[PDB]
Write a protein that holds these residues in place. Structure first.
Motif, PDB file in Angstrom:
ATOM      1  N   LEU A  17      -6.571  12.916   1.188  1.00 14.85           N
ATOM      2  CA  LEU A  17      -5.916  13.185   2.133  1.00 14.85           C
ATOM      3  C   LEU A  17      -6.184  14.696   2.333  1.00 14.85           C
ATOM      4  CD1 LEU A  17      -2.800  11.659   0.773  1.00 14.85           C
ATOM      5  CD2 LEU A  17      -3.669  11.078   3.027  1.00 14.85           C
ATOM      6  N   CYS A  74       1.002   8.174   4.425  1.00 15.25           N
ATOM      7  CA  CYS A  74       0.484   8.390   3.224  1.00 15.25           C
ATOM      8  C   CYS A  74       0.465  10.228   3.176  1.00 15.25           C
ATOM      9  CB  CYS A  74      -0.772   7.458   3.440  1.00 15.25           C
ATOM     10  SG  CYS A  74      -1.415   6.049   4.116  1.00 15.25           S
ATOM     11  N   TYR A 132       0.679  -1.124  -0.084  1.00  9.67           N
ATOM     12  CA  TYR A 132       0.068   0.035  -0.065  1.00  9.67           C
ATOM     13  C   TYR A 132       0.789   1.152   0.077  1.00  9.67           C
ATOM     14  CZ  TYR A 132      -3.680   3.188   1.379  1.00  9.67           C
ATOM     15  OH  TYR A 132      -4.335   4.501   1.160  1.00  9.67           O
ATOM     16  N   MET A 191       1.179   4.166  -2.841  1.00  7.02           N
ATOM     17  CA  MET A 191       0.920   5.626  -2.763  1.00  7.02           C
ATOM     18  C   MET A 191       2.297   6.246  -3.168  1.00  7.02           C
ATOM     19  SD  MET A 191      -1.335   7.504  -1.480  1.00  7.02           S
ATOM     20  CE  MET A 191      -2.531   6.895  -0.548  1.00  7.02           C
ATOM     21  N   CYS A 225      -2.561   4.057   8.110  1.00  7.73           N
ATOM     22  CA  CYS A 225      -1.483   4.691   7.782  1.00  7.73           C
ATOM     23  C   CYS A 225      -1.807   6.006   7.279  1.00  7.73           C
ATOM     24  CB  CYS A 225      -0.835   4.164   7.199  1.00  7.73           C
ATOM     25  SG  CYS A 225      -1.316   4.055   5.562  1.00  7.73           S
ATOM     26  N   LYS A 226      -2.740   6.417   7.226  1.00  3.29           N
ATOM     27  CA  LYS A 226      -3.177   8.001   6.807  1.00  3.29           C
ATOM     28  C   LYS A 226      -2.080   8.612   6.987  1.00  3.29           C
ATOM     29  CE  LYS A 226      -8.029   9.689   6.315  1.00  3.29           C
ATOM     30  NZ  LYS A 226      -9.207   9.932   7.191  1.00  3.29           N
ATOM     31  N   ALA A 273      -5.150   1.306   5.216  1.00  6.70           N
ATOM     32  CA  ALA A 273      -5.255   2.719   4.482  1.00  6.70           C
ATOM     33  C   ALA A 273      -5.688   3.623   5.629  1.00  6.70           C
ATOM     34  CB  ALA A 273      -6.671   2.801   3.475  1.00  6.70           C
TER      35      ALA A 273
HETATM   36 HG   LIG Z   1      -3.752   6.936   3.053  1.00  7.85          HG
END
Ligand SMILES: [Hg+2]
Ligand SMILES: [Hg+2]
Ligand SMILES: [Hg+2]
Ligand SMILES: [Hg+2]
Ligand SMILES: [Hg+2]
Ligand SMILES: [Hg+2]
Ligand SMILES: [Hg+2]
Ligand SMILES: [Hg+2]
Ligand SMILES: [Hg+2]
Ligand SMILES: [Hg+2]
Ligand SMILES: [Hg+2]
Ligand SMILES: [Hg+2]
Ligand SMILES: [Hg+2]
Ligand SMILES: [Mn+2]
Ligand SMILES: [Mn+2]
Ligand SMILES: [Mn+2]
Ligand SMILES: [Mn+2]
Lengths: 340, 340
Positions: free
Chosen positions: A321, A272, A194, A198, A268-269, A265
Motif C-alpha cells: 500500500l 485497506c 480479506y 487486513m 478494495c485497496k 484486493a
Molecule cells: Hg488491499
C-alpha cells in the motif's frame, strides 16, 4: 455446509486457501504453500512457558514506581491482555470454518494456541506485581478508553462469523428469513474475510509493536526486567504471526490462489489504506490517556506519535500500500536491541 | 449472537460451562473448576515433537513383516490418522462458540492443539516407513471399512455445529426460512451437546485405546520401535483429554453446573448407554477387516474383542452408566508397560 470430515477424496494441493472444500485428512508430507509449514515448525521451536520466567523483582520495581509511570505500565499491560484474549479465540472461531488446505488449518490452530500462552504470561505478571488481580482484569472490560483504541477488532470478527453461518446454513442466494429478505453472496463474504485479515495484520504488526515499545522503555531504565524477558518472547512469536498474514495477503493479491481474491484486493485497496490509517490514529489517541497524569523521560506522546508513523509506514509497504506518513528514521532505535 | 469480546463485566466464576455469556477476558488467576487449569498445565509440561523420535529402522521392520501383519499395522495407523484429523479441528469449531468460562475455553484450544501434533507424528511415521505417502493418506478418505465410524463421529459434531448456528443467528422459537418452519430450542441444543460430549468421550476413551493395543503388540515383539515411542507419548496425552471429557460430563449430570443439564442427562440415559455399546461393536467389527489375511502372535480377534469389552466397562463405569459386558480382568496385562 460445514463438515468436520468431508467425504470427497480431493487434491488438497489444488484447493484455494479459503472457501474451498473443508479439510478432512491432516497430512504434512506435502503442502501447496510451504511457508505455513515453515511457520508451524518455527513456532513449535519457540515453545516457551511463562511460569518459568522469574518476575519477583518486578513486584519491588513496580512498587518503587511513581504513580504516573505505574499508570503507564498497567494501562499498556491491560491493552496487551485485551488483544491476546481476542487473538486466542478468534483465529479459531472466525477463520477455521473457512480453510481448505491442511497447512493453513494447523498454522491457524498453532497461532491461536501461542496467543493463549501470551494470555497466561499476562496472568503471571499481574499476579506478581499487583495484590488483587481482579481490579486489573475487571477494568479491561469496562475502561472506555481501552475499548476506544480497540474499536473495530471484535466487530470485524463478529460480522465475519455471522455471515459465514448464514452461508453455511443457507448457501448463496436471496432468502426469506422470518419475512425479511437476506442475500448471501460469496463475493461479499470473501471481501469480509480479506478485510478481516487486513485488520489482523494491522493488530499484530502495529498495535502490539507500539505496546512493546512502551514495555521496553522501562527495561531501558533497568526496571521491570522480568516483564521485559517475557515480552521479548511474545515479540518473537508476533514476528511469526505477522509474517503469516503478510504472506496470506500477498499470495491472495498475487492472484496465484483464488483469482477472485486478486480482484477483491484491487477493488478494495482504498478500504485497506483506510483501516491502517484508522488504526494508526487510534494508537495515537491513546497517548492522551497513557500520559494523562504525567509523562516519562524517554517516553511521551511526541515519541509515541513519531513511532506509530514510523511503524505504520513499514507495515503498509510490506503489503503493497501507499505510505500515509512522511518518511522518517526510527525515533527509538534502542528498541532494536530488544527485538523480534 | 456470538461475540469475540462481550462488553458486559460479568463474574465468570458464576457462569455455566456452556451457553452462558461468551468469555471476554482470558484470566488464569482464579477459575470456576480447577481441573481445566490443571489439565492445561499438565498438557503444557508434556510437550514433545515427533521429529526427534527416529523412526528410521521401522522401515526395515515394516518391510520384513508378513503381508497380513503389515495390513494390520497400516490399517490401524490409518484409523489413528482419521480420528486425530477430526480431533484437531472439531473441539475448536464445535465447543468454542458455546463456552462461558475461560479455563474451559483455553483447555479446548490446548486440547485441540495437542491433537495436531499427533497428526504431525503420523506423517513423520508414514513418510519414513512407506516411501509413497499418498497411497496411505488418500485411502483414509475412501476406505469403506474406516468409513462407517468416520461418518458417525462427524455427524454428532456437524449437527451440533448446525444447530448452534441457528441458535446464535435466530435465537429460540419458531422461525420460517424460505417456506419451511424451523424450530430452535435451547433444550434440544443442550441434549445435542451432551450426546456429542458423550461421543467424544467414547472416541478418546475406547476407540483410541483399542488402537493402542494394536500398536504395542508390535513393540512387544521389538518391531516398529520408533512408532512405539511415539504412541507412548500420544497415549500419555490421551489420558488427559479423557480426564477432561469425564469431568465435563460428570459435572454436567451432577446438576452442580446447570440444573437443566442434570435433567437432560437423566432423560438421555438409555441412548447414552446405546451410543457406547454401538462404539464398542464398531470396534469389535474392525477386527474382521484386520484379521483379513490372517492373525499375529500376541494378538488375535478374540483377545482383542475381550479388551474392547473390558475397556468399555471401565469407561462407562467412570461416567456412571450401567456396565454392558460381563466383568473380567484385563485380558492383556502386558499393555500397562506402555500406558500411563
Ligand atoms: Hg488491499
Ligand atoms: Hg480475521
Ligand atoms: Hg478481523
Ligand atoms: Hg509506546
Ligand atoms: Hg503523530
Ligand atoms: Hg461429538
Ligand atoms: Hg463434541
Ligand atoms: Hg487394533
Ligand atoms: Hg498391531
Ligand atoms: Hg487391538
Ligand atoms: Hg445421554
Ligand atoms: Hg447419561
Ligand atoms: Hg453415550
Ligand atoms: Mn500475542
Ligand atoms: Mn499474535
Ligand atoms: Mn490424539
Ligand atoms: Mn485426544
Amino acid at each position: 455446509a460445514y463438515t468436520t470430515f468431508s467425504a470427497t477424496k480431493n487434491d488438497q494441493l489444488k484447493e484455494p486457501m479459503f472457501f474451498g472444500q473443508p479439510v478432512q485428512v491432516a497430512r504434512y508430507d506435502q503442502q501447496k504453500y510451504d511457508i505455513f509449514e515453515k511457520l508451524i515448525e518455527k513456532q513449535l521451536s519457540f515453545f516457551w512457558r511463562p511460569e518459568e520466567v522469574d518476575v519477583s523483582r518486578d513486584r519491588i520495581d513496580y512498587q518503587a514506581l511513581p504513580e504516573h509511570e505505574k499508570h503507564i505500565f498497567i494501562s499498556n499491560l491491560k491493552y496487551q491482555t485485551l488483544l491476546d484474549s481476542i487473538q486466542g479465540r478468534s483465529p479459531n472461531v472466525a477463520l477455521l470454518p473457512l480453510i481448505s488446505i491442511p497447512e493453513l488449518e494447523t498454522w491457524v490452530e498453532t497461532w491461536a494456541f501461542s496467543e493463549t500462552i501470551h494470555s497466561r504470561s499476562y496472568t503471571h505478571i499481574i499476579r506478581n506485581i499487583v495484590n488483587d488481580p481482579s481490579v486489573v482484569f475487571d477494568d479491561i472490560v469496562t475502561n472506555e478508553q481501552i475499548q476506544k483504541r480497540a474499536e473495530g477488532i471484535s466487530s470485524y470478527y463478529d460480522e465475519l462469523i455471522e455471515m459465514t453461518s448464514y452461508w453455511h446454513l443457507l448457501g448463496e442466494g436471496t432468502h426469506t428469513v422470518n419475512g425479511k429478505t437476506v442475500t448471501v453472496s460469496l463475493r461479499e463474504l470473501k471481501k469480509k474475510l480479506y478485510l478481516c485479515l487486513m485488520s489482523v495484520n494491522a493488530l499484530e504488526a502495529i498495535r502490539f509493536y507500539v505496546s512493546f515499545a512502551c514495555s521496553f522503555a522501562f527495561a531501558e531504565r533497568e526496571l521491570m526486567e522480568g516483564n521485559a524477558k517475557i515480552i521479548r518472547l511474545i515479540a518473537r512469536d508476533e514476528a511469526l504471526h505477522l509474517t503469516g498474514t503478510q504472506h496470506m495477503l500477498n499470495l491472495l493479491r498475487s492472484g496465484a490462489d483464488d483469482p477472485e481474491m486478486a480482484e477483491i484486493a484491487e477493488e478494495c485497496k482504498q478500504e485497506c489504506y483506510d483501516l491502517f490509517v484508522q488504526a494508526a490514529q487510534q494508537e495515537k489517541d491513546w497517548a492522551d490517556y497513557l500520559f494523562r497524569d504525567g509523562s516519562m523521560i524517554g517516553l511521551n506522546k511526541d515519541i509515541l506519535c513519531q513511532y506509530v508513523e514510523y511503524i505504520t509506514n513499514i507495515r503498509m509497504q510490506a503489503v503493497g500500500l501507499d505510505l500515509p506518513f512522511n518518511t522518517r528514521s526510527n525515533p527509538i532505535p534502542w528498541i532494536n536491541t530488544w527485538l523480534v
